[PDB]
mmCIF file of C-alpha atoms and ligand atoms in Angstrom:
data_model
loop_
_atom_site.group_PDB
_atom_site.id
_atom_site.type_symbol
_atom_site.label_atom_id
_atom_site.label_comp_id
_atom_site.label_asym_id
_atom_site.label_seq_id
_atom_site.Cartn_x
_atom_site.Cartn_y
_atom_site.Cartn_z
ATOM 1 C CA UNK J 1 -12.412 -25.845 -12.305
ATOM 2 C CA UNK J 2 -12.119 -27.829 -15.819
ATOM 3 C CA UNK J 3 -9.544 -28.825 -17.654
ATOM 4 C CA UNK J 4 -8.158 -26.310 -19.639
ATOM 5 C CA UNK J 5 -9.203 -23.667 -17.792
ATOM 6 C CA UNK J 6 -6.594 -20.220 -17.002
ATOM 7 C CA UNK J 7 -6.263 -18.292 -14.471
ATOM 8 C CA UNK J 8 -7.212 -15.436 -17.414
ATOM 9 C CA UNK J 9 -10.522 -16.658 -17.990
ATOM 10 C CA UNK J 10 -11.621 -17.123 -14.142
ATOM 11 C CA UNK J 11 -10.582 -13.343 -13.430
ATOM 12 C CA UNK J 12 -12.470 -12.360 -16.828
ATOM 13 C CA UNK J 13 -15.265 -14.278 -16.251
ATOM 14 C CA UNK J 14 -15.399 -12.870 -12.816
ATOM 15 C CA UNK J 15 -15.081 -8.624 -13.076
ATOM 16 C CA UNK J 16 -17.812 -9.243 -16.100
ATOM 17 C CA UNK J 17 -19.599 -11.648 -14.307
ATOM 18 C CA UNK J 18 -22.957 -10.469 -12.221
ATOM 19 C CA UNK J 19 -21.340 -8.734 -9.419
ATOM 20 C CA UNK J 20 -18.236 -6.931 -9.443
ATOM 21 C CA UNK J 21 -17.447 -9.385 -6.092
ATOM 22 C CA UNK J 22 -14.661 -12.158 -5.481
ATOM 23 C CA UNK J 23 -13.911 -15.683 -7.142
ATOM 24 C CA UNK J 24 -16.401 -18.592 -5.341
ATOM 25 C CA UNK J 25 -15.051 -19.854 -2.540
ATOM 26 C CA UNK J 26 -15.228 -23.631 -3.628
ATOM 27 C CA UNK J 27 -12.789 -22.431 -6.361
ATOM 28 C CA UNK J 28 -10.825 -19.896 -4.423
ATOM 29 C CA UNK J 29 -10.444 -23.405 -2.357
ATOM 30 C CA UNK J 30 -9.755 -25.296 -5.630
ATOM 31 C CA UNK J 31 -7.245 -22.530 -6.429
ATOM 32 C CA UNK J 32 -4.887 -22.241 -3.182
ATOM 33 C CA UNK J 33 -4.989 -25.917 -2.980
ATOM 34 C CA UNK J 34 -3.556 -26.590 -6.436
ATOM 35 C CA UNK J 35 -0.655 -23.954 -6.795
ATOM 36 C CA UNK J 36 2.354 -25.044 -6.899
ATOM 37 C CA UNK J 37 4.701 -22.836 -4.914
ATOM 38 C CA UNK J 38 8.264 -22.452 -6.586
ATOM 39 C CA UNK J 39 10.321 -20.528 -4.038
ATOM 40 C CA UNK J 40 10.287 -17.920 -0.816
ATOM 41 C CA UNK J 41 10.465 -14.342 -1.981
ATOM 42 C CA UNK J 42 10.277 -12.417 0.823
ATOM 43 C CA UNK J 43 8.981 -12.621 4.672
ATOM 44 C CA UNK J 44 8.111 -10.711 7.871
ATOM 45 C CA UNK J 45 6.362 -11.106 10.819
ATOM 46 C CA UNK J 46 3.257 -11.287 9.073
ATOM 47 C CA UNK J 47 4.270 -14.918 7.921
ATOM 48 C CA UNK J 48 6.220 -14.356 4.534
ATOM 49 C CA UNK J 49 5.105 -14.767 1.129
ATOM 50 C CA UNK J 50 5.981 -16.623 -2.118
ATOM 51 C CA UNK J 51 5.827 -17.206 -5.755
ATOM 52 C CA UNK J 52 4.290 -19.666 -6.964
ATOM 53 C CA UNK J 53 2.395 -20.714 -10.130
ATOM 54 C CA UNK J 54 -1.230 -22.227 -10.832
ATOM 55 C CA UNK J 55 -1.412 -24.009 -14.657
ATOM 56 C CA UNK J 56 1.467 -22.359 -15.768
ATOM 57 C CA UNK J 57 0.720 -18.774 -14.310
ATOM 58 C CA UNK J 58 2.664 -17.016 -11.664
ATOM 59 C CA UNK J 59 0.777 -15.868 -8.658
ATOM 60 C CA UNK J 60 1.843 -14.258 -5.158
ATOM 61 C CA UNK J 61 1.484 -16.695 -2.168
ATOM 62 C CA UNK J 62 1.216 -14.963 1.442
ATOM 63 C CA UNK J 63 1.490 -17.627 3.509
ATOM 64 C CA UNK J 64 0.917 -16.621 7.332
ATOM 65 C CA UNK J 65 1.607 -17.977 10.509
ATOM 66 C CA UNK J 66 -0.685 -19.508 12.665
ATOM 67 C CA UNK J 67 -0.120 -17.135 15.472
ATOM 68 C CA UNK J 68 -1.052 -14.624 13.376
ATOM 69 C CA UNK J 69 -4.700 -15.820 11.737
ATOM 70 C CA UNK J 70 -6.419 -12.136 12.435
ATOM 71 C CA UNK J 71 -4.155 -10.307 9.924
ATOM 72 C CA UNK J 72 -4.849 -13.158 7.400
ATOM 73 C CA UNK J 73 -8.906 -12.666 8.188
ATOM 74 C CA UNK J 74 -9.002 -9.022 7.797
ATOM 75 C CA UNK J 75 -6.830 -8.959 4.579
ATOM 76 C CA UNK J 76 -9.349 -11.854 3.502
ATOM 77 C CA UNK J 77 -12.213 -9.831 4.480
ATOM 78 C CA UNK J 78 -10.828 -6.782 2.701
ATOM 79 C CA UNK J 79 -9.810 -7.530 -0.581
ATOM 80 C CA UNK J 80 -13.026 -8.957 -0.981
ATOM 81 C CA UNK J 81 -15.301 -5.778 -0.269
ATOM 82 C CA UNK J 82 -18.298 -5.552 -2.199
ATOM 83 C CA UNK J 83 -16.715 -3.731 -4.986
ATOM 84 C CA UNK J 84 -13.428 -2.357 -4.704
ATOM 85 C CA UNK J 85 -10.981 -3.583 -7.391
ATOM 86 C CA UNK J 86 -8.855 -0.458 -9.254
ATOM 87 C CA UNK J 87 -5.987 -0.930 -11.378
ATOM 88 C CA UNK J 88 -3.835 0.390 -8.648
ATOM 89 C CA UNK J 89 -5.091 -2.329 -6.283
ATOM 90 C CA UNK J 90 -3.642 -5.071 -5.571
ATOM 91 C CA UNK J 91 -5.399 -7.973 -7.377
ATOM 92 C CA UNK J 92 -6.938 -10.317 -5.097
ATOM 93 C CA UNK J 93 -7.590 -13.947 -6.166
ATOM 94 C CA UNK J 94 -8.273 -16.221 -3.129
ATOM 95 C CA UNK J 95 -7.797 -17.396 0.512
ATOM 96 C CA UNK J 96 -7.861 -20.426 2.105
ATOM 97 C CA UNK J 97 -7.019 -22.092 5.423
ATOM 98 C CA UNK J 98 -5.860 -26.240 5.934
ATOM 99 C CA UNK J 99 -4.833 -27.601 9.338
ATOM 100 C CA UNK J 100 -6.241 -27.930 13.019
ATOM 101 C CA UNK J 101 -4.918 -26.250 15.820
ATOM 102 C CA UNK J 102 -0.948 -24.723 15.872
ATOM 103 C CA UNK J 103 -0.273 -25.743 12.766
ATOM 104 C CA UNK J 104 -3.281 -24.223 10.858
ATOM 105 C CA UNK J 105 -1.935 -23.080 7.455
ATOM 106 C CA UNK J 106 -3.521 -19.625 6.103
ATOM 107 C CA UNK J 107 -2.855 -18.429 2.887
ATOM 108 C CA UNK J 108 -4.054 -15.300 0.285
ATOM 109 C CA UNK J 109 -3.043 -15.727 -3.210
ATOM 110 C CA UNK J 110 -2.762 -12.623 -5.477
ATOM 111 C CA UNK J 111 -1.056 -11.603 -8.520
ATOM 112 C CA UNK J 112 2.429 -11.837 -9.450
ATOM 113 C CA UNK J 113 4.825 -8.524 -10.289
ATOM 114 C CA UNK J 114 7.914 -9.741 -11.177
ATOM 115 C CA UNK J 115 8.762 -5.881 -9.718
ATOM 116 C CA UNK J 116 7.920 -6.171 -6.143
ATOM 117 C CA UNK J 117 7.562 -3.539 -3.638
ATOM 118 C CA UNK J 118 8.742 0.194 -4.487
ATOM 119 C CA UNK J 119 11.522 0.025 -1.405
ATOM 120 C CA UNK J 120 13.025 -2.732 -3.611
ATOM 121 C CA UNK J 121 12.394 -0.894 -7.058
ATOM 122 C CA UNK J 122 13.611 2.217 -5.460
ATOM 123 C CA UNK J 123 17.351 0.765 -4.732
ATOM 124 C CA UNK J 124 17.931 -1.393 -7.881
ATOM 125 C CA UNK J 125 16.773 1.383 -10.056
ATOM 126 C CA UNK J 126 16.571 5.544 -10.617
ATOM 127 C CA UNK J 127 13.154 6.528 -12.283
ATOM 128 C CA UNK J 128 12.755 9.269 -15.217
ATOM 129 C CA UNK J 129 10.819 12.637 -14.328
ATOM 130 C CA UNK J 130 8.481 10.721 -16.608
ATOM 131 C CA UNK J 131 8.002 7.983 -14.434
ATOM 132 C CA UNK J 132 8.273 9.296 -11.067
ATOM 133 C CA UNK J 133 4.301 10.761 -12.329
ATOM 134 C CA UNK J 134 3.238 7.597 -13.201
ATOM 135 C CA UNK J 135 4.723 6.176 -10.028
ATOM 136 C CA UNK J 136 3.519 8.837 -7.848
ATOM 137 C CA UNK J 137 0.319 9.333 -9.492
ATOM 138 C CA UNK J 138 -0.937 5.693 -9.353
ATOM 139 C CA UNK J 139 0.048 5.809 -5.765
ATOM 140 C CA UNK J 140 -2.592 8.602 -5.694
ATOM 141 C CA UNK J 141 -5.175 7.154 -7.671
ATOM 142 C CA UNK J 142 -4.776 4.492 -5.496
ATOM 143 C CA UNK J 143 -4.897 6.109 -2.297
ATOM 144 C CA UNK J 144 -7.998 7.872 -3.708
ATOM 145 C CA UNK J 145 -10.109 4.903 -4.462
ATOM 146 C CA UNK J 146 -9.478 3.297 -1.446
ATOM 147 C CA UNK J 147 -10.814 6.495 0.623
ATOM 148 C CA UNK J 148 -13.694 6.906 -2.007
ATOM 149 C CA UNK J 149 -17.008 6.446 -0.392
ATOM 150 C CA UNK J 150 -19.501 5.027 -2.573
ATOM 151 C CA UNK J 151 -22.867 4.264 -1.990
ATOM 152 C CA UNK J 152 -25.787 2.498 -2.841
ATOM 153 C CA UNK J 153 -26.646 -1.209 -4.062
ATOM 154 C CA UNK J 154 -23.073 -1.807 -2.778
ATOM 155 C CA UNK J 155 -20.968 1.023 -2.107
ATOM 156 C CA UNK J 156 -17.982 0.219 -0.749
ATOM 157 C CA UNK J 157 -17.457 1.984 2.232
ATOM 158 C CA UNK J 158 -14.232 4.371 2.614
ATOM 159 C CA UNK J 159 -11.422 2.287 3.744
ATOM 160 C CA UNK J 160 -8.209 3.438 4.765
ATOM 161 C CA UNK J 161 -4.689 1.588 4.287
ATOM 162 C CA UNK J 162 -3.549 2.738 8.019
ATOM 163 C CA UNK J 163 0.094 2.115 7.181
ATOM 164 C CA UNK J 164 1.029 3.392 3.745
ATOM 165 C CA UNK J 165 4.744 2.458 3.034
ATOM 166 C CA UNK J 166 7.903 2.086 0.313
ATOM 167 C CA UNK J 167 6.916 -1.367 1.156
ATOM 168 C CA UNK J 168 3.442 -2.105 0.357
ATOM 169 C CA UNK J 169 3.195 -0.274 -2.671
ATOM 170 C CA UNK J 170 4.355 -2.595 -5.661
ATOM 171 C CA UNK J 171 4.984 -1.602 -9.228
ATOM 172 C CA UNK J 172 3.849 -3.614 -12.227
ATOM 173 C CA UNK J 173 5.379 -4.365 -15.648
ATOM 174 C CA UNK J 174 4.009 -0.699 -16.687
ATOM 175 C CA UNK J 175 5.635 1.446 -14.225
ATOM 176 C CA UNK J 176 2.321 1.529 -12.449
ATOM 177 C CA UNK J 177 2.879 0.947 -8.714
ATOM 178 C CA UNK J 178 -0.572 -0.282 -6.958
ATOM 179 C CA UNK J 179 -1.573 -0.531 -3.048
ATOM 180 C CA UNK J 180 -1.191 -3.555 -0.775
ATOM 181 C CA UNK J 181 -1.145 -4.995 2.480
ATOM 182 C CA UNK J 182 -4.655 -4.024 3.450
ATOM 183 C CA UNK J 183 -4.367 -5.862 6.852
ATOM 184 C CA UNK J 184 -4.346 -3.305 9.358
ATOM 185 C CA UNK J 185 -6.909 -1.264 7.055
ATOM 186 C CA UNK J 186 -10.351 -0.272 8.568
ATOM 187 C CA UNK J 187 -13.535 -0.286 6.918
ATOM 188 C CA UNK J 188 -16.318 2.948 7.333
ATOM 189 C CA UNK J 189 -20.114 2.205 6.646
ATOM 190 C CA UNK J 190 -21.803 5.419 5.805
ATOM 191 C CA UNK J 191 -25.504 4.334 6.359
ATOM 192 C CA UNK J 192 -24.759 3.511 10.214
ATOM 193 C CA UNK J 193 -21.564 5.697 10.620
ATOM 194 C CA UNK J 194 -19.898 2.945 11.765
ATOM 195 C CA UNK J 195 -15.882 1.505 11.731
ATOM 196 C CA UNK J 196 -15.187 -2.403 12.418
ATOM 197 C CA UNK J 197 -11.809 -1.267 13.867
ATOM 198 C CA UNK J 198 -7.674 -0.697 17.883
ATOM 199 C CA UNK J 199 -4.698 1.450 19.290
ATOM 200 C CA UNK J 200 -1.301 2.798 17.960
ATOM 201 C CA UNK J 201 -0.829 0.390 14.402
ATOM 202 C CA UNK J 202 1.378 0.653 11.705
ATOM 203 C CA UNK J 203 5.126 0.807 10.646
ATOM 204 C CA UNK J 204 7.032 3.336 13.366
ATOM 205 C CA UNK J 205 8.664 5.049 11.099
ATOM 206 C CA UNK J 206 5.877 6.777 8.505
ATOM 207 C CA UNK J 207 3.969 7.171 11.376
ATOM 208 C CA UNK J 208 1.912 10.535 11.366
ATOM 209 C CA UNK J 209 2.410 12.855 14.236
ATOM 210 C CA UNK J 210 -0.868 12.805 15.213
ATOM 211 C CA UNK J 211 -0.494 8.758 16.155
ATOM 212 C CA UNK J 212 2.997 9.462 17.723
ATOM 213 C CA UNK J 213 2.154 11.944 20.551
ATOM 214 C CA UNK J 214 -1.202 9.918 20.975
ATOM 215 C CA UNK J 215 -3.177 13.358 20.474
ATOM 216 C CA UNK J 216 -5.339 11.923 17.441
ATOM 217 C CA UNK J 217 -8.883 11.224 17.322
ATOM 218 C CA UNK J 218 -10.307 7.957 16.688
ATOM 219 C CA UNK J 219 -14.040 8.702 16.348
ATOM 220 C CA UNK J 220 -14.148 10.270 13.315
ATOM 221 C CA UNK J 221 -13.213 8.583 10.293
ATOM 222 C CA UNK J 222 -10.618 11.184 8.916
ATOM 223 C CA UNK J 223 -8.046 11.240 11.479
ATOM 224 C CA UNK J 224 -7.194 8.017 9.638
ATOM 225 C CA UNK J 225 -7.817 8.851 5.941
ATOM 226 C CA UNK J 226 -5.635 11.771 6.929
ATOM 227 C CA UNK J 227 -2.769 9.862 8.598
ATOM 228 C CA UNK J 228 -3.136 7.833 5.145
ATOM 229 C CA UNK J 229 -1.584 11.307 3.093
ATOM 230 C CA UNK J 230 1.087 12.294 5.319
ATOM 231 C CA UNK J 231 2.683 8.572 5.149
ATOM 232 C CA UNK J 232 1.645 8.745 0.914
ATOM 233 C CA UNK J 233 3.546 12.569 1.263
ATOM 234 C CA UNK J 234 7.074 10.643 2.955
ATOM 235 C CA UNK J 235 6.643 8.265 0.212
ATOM 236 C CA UNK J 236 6.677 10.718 -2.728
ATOM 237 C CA UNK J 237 9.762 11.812 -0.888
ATOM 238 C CA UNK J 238 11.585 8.819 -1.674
ATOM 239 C CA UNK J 239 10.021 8.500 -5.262
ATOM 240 C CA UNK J 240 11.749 11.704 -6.196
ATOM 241 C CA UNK J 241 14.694 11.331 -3.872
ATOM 242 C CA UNK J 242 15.993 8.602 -6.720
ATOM 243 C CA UNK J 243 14.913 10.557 -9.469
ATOM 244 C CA UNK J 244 17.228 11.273 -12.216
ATOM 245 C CA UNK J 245 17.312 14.733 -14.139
ATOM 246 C CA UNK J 246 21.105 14.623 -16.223
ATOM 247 C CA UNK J 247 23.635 13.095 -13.906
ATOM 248 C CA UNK J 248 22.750 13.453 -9.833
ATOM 249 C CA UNK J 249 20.075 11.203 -8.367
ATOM 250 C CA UNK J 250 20.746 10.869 -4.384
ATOM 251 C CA UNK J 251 20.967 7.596 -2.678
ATOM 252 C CA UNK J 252 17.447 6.446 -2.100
ATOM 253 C CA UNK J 253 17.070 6.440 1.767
ATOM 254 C CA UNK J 254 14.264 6.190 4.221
ATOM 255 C CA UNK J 255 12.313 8.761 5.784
ATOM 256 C CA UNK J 256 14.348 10.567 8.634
ATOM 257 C CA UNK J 257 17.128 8.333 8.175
ATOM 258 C CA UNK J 258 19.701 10.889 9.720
ATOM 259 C CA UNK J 259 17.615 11.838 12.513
ATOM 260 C CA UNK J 260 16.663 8.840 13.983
ATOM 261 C CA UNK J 261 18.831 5.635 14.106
ATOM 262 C CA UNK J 262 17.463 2.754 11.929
ATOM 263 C CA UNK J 263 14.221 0.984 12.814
ATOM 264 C CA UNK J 264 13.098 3.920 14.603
ATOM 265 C CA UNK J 265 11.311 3.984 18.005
ATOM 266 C CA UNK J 266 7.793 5.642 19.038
ATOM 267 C CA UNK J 267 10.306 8.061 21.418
ATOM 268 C CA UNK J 268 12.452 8.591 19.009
ATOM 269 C CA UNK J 269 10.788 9.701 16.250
ATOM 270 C CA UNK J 270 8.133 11.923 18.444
ATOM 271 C CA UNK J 271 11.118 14.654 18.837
ATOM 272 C CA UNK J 272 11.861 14.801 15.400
ATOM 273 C CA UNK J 273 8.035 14.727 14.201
ATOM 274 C CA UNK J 274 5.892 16.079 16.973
ATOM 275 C CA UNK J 275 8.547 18.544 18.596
ATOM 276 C CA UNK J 276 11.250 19.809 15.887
ATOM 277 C CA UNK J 277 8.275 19.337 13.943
ATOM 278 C CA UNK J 278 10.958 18.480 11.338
ATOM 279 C CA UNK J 279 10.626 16.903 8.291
ATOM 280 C CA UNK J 280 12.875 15.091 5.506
ATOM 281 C CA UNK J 281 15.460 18.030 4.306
ATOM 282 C CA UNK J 282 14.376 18.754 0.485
ATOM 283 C CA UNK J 283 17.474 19.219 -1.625
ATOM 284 C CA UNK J 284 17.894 22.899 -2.735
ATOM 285 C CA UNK J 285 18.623 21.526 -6.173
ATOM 286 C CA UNK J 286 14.915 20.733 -6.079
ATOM 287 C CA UNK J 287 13.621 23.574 -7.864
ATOM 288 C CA UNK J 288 14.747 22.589 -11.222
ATOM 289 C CA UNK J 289 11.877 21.163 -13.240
ATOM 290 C CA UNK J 290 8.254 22.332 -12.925
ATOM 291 C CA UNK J 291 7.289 18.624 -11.844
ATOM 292 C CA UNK J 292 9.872 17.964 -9.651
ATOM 293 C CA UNK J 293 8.531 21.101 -7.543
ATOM 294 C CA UNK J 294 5.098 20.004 -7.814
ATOM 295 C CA UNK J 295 5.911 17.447 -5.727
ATOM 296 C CA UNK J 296 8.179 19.195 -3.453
ATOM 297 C CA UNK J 297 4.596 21.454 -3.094
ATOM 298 C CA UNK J 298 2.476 18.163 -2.155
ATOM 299 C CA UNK J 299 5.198 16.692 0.032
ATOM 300 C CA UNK J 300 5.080 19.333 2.417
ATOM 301 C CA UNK J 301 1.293 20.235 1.727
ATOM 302 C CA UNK J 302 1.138 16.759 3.357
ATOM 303 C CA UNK J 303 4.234 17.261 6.304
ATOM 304 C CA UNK J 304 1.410 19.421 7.855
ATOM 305 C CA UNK J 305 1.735 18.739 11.353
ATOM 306 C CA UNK J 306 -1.848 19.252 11.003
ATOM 307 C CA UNK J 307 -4.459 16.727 10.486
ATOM 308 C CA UNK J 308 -7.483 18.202 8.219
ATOM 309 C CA UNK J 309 -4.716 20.936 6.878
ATOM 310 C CA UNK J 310 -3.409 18.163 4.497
ATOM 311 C CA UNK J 311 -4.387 17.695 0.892
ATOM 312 C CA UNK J 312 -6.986 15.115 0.098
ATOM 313 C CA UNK J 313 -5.964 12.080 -1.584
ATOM 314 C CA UNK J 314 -8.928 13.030 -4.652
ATOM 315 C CA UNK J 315 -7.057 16.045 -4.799
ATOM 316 C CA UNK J 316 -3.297 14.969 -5.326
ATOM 317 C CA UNK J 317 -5.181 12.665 -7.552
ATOM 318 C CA UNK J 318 -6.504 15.389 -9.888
ATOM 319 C CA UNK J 319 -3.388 17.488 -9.452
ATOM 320 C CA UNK J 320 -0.827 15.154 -11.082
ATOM 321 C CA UNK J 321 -3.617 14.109 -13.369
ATOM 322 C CA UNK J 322 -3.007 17.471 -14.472
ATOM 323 C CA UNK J 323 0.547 17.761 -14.566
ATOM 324 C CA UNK J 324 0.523 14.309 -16.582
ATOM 325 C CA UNK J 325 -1.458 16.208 -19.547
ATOM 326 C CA UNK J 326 0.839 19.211 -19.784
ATOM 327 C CA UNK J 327 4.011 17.234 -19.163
ATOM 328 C CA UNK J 328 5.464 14.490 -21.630
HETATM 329 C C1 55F R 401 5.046 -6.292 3.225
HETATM 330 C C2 55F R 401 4.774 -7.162 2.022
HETATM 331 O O1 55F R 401 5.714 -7.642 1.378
HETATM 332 N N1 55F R 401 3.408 -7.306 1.798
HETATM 333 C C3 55F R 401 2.896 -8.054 0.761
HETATM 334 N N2 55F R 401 1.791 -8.738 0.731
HETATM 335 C C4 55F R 401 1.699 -9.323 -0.512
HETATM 336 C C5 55F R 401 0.548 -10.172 -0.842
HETATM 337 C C6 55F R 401 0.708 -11.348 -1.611
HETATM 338 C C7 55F R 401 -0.411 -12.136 -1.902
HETATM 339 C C8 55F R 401 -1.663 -11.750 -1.430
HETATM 340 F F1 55F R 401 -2.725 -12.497 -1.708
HETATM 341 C C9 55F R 401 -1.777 -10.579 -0.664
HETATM 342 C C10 55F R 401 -3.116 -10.148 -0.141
HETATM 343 N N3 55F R 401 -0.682 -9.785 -0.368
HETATM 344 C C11 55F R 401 2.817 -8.969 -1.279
HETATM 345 C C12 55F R 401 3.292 -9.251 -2.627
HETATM 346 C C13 55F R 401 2.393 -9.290 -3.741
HETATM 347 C C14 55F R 401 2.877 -9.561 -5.048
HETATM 348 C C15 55F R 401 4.244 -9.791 -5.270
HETATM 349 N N4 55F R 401 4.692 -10.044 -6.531
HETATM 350 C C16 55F R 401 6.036 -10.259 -6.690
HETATM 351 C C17 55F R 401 6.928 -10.227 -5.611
HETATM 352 N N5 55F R 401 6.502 -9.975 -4.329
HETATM 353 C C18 55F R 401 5.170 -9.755 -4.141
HETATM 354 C C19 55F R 401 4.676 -9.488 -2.849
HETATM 355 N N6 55F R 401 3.550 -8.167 -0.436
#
């Protein structure tokens, strides 16, 4: 990297450069190794990540733990597939690795939104009718490129997030929120029919019912990008659930918070899901606005205890694409 050089021109040079792949590794290398972390926003089990900036420009550090070098490889893997790259996707920039043995030190550096995640954005603020579209429809657009299939020179296959949450979805400067987290994420090659996977994954509480009373089927690529709605569906919930229309704008809370007892167990949410078949108690005073019911629509033509029953991802896409022309 020469002198002078910004973290602008790299990224620039890189979408317009040949192909629409990653930064070289050399310079990813060059990259990691020259940031200059500031301070610890935020951790987990995954490691935890910080801020940090490279020449002057902010960037996201995920630093993991040793122990835990697989979710750091398939992240890594990931982010860097052939060509997927939308607005509502997480920027990648680099990863890197430095010691020997327990102390190895694995890192992915992205892009900085001073923001953070929606479960954070969600309880320091209360959205417009306006936003809660932009919000929700990102989400969508998101959710949607990640399951589109291409194919081709280098199509990238249909991936799917396999634990959509409050948490991983962050929201820029723009009110645009944009996926993240891709670790437990599977990849689906369409020329082969294949899927680099392997058992029950993801956060225990947006769980889908067909992952919480086991009865879900693996083989076929959907029950996943299905399982990828439902948990979308809980998270419009939310989205909504803080939205303000002249005065009353409920608490944000988490899905099936007064059902089952904070951090949630597989037990314990399979009679509320799979059994009672229950499902986050919409507000009467719902049916006010012609958006605000749109959703209400969605979030339950998602609650399907029903795999292929729920709405496609395209769709919701499409949908609120709509409802953004006519509205505002
Ligand atoms: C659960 C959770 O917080 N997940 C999570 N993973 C990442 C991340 C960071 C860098 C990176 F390279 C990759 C691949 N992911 C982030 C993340 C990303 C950007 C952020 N910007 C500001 C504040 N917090 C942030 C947090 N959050």
């Amino acid at each position: 990297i020469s002198e002078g050089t910004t973290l602008k021109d790299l990224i620039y040079d890189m979408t317009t450069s040949g192909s629409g792949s990653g930064l070289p590794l050399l310079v990813q290398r060059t990259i990691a190794r020259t940031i200059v972390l500031q301070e610890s926003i935020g951790k987990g089990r995954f490691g935890e990540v910080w801020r940090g900036k490279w020449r002057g420009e902010e960037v996201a550090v995920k630093i993991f733990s040793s122990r835990e070098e697989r979710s750091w490889f398939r992240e890594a893997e990931i982010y860097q597939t052939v060509m997927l790259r939308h607005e509502n996707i997480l920027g990648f920039i680099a990863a890197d690795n430095k010691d020997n043995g327990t102390w190895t030190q694995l890192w992915l550096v992205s892009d900085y939104h001073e923001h953070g995640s929606l479960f954070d954005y969600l309880n320091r603020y209360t959205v417009t009718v306006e936003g809660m579209i932009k919000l929700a429809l990102s989400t969508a657009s998101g959710l949607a490129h990640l399951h589109m299939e291409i194919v081709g020179t280098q199509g990238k296959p249909a991936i799917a997030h396999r634990d959509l949450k409050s948490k991983n979805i962050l929201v820029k400067k723009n009110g645009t929120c944009c996926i993240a987290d891709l670790g437990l994420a599977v990849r689906h090659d369409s020329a082969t029919d294949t899927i680099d996977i392997n058992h029950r994954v993801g956060t225990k509480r947006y769980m889908a019912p067909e992952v919480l009373d086991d009865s879900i089927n693996m083989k076929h690529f959907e029950s996943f990008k299905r399982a990828d709605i439902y948990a979308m569906g809980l998270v419009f919930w939310e989205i909504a659930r803080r939205c303000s229309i002249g005065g009353i704008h409920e608490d944000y809370q988490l899905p099936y918070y007064d059902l089952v007892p904070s951090d949630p167990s597989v037990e314990e949410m399979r009679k509320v899901v799979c059994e009672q078949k229950l499902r986050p108690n919409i507000p009467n005073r719902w049916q006010s606005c012609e958006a605000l019911r749109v959703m209400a629509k969605i979030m339950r033509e998602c609650w399907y205890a029903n795999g292929a029953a729920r709405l496609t991802a395209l769709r919701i896409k499409k949908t609120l694409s709509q409802l953004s022309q006519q509205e505002g």
